[PDB]
């Protein structure tokens, strides 16, 4: 099928392409954020939110992928092979999981509408040529 | 983070491993079942149900896994090494995805509670001696 | 001290004396059944029922017996006598444990009264010669004989 | 499963680890006490209490372990072996069984809460260095 994991949440894979690949934090950083803020809800027996559901599934997907790649490397012989293997992973699958984790953790921390408006505004900012681009990029905050 | 993908629905990996691995259908068959029965709701922009959410996420996960496995198989030279990697991915991740897709499809089809009762009943059945159990294996049916 | 582990639950050993050994699932099968159906309640800090209590005690007993028998088979110094050791175990203690675990898991799934009636009827059946009894034993199941769930 | 036989009775294997292993009486003594005090209730057709249930099960388990170890010592030839076997038994399985029997008998006799508090206090006593450790170890008593 051709499923978009975001249009169920009011976005698309092309609205999140407004943000470059350089923008998304590491999976370690995002998993730490989750474990810090929504651990007792992700480990809960409740349908607390579609965002929680999707975050659980994404974490399990990252687990499966890491396990596969690690077993591959451990069973593979050459080191450079392993190196560009994990490079391809971090480039293709890690990026998608980063986008997903960011989207969901931000929709939990700030709000779905807030995050979508942030995406629009950051697209404005990053389309704006640098000569006319302010330095104070848009950012998500519960503060002034 | 010690996440169970089934306890927000009322199940557990212990309750799904309570059935033989040789019971869950092929992931191809399950994906076809989904494409036939709920494609219009999985490709929809609606929180139709947590089952739909998890099903979308699981389909995407399987897609990513297959992409990676195909990539590493193409990279590898030996069909022996390819057999190794495909057998591993099947045995572990394909089995997990089989369990997940079966759970969610069967739930959307028959009922979460019917599926859980079916799990326990089929487990007790397959663990019971044949001379002291009903001879026909249990099965789910929408037909009276 | 002349204790019957079932007299408290309304049964006896003379009532389960009729059930054959081929009737009870393996100990691993029964332990898995318990882990899947009542693990949350057996690992709980509550008195859920005497059946839960006795199930916990029986699982602990089986663990102790397993440790003992494995240590023995290991330190025996002849891989030929471990066969007879495990034979004795699976013939006496494994059988008692299967009996007990089955009784409790069943009195939890179905009712205590249901299980006792099943035992009475199964005794009627197994005491009857094959030439005069029906060929298919009575059945205790959460399913109809057709086994189709809707 | 990770069943704790005392969690439903308000204790744990960490609370009874305070008491040493040389503290618990012999299974003979414990069974004599159990008979004398609660025979007509353990031989009874009643869920008189979960303590009674667990005590019955423990007595049966001990009888079973003894049957097994007896059969093993018989079919074994070397007396050194046989003594090593029964020593292993007395050190692991007999120890756990008499922990359980002590817990449940003492509970039936004095109160589950009395016994929990006794465990805590005995921990205090056994952790107290000997220069300040009273010789009068804590003891369960009604009068």
Author numbering:
A (entry chain D), B (entry chain C): 1 to 144
C (entry chain B): 1 to 150
D (entry chain A): 1 to 143
What did the study's authors say about this model?
The inner shell is an icosahedral capsid formed by 240 copies of hepatitis B core protein (HBc). The N-terminal domain of HBc is mainly α-helical and assembles into dimers, which form protruding spikes at the capsid surface. Peptides based on the hexapeptide “LLGRMK” block the interaction between capsids and L-HBs and inhibit virion formation. These peptides bind to the tips of the spikes where envelope and capsid are in touch but are distant from the hydrophobic pocket.
Here we revisit two peptides of this family (P1: “MHRSLLGRMKGA”; P2: “GSLLGRMKGA”) and clarify whether mutations in HBc that change the secretion phenotype also impact the binding of these peptides. Therefore, we determined structures for WT-HBc, F97L-HBc, P5T-HBc and L60V-HBc with bound peptides. P1 and P2 peptides bound to the tips of the spikes at the dimer interface and altered the whole protruding part of the spikes as evidenced by the low local correlation between maps of the same variant with and without bound peptides. Model-building showed that peptide-binding splayed the loops at the tips of the spikes apart. The splaying was transmitted throughout the protruding part of the spike tilting the ascending helix α3 and the descending helix α4 outwards. Model building of HBc into the maps leaves unaccounted density at the tips of the spikes between the rearranged loops that were attributed to the peptide density. The length of this density could accommodate 5–6 amino acids, which is only a fraction of the P1 and P2 peptides. The elongated flat shape of the density matches an extended stretch, but not an α-helix. In our hands, the shorter P2 is better soluble and induces the same conformational changes as the longer P1, which binds stronger, but causes aggregation of HBc capsids.
